[PDB]
Design a protein around this ligand. Structure first.
Ligand SMILES: CC#Cc1ccc2c(=O)[nH]c(CSc3ccc(C(=O)O)cc3)nc2c1C
Length: 190
């Protein structure tokens, strides 16, 4: 075992990288004021995420395996996520609706809810802009611990994630370590 070593680089508003994260965010969260957008540089978590991506790309054909989603969390889970990512222990902070794992919203305004990006003592809310390996997904249920198996004859091979609606997804549930990378942290208020 390694990692637990990361750097946090604050993006300057003059920087286009900032305006791109802010634009995807403002599509649903234009009513909030961004205090800072930081980039989370965890090399060991990133290398493990890329190696999972190389595998998914080599098995899911034409599928765009990676999506950039949102994850709202409390002020105190920021150290944890920045070190471990969204590991199996962090599952116990999320819901169970579509299975035991980590939930990611498509629209930042779902993740902006006070139940998820709980405002701290200063009133700051934390929403991550995560790189998620969504791959091939099915419909989820509360009883899941691992994604359902694709084929009944071949049940060793399973779905990569689960969603609320397969034709019009709004949220995804990831179940394995290294499936999600907390690339950006968006800190904001009301
Ligand atoms: C059904 C549904 C949902 C959904 C949609 C978006 C998010 C999200 O952006 N982050 C998280 C993890 S933070 C969290 C905090 C408290 C609770 C709770 O009290 O149930 C759930 C999740 N969970 C999310 C969840 C659970």
């Amino acid at each position: 075992m390694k990692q637990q070593n990361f750097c946090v680089v604050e993006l300057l508003p003059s920087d286009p990288e900032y305006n791109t994260v802010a634009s995807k965010f403002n599509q649903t969260c234009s009513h909030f004021r961004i205090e800072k957008i930081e980039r989370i540089q965890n090399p060991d978590l990133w290398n493990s995420y890329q190696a999972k991506k190389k595998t998914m790309d080599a098995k899911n054909g034409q599928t765009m395996n990676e999506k950039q989603l949102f994850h709202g969390t409390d002020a105190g889970s920021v150290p944890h996520v920045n070190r471990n990512g969204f590991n199996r222990s962090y599952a116990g902070k999320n819901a169970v609706a579509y299975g035991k794992g980590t939930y990611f919203a498509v629209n930042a305004n779902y993740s902006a809810n006070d139940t998820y990006s709980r405002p701290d003592a200063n009133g700051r809310k934390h929403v991550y802009y995560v790189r998620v390996l969504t791959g091939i997904y099915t419909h989820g249920n509360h009883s899941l611990i691992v994604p359902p198996s694709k084929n009944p004859q071949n049940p060793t091979d399973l779905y990569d994630t689960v969603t609320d609606n397969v034709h019009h997804p709004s949220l995804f549930v990831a179940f394995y370590d290294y499936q999600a990378y907390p690339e950006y942290l968006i800190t904001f208020r009301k």
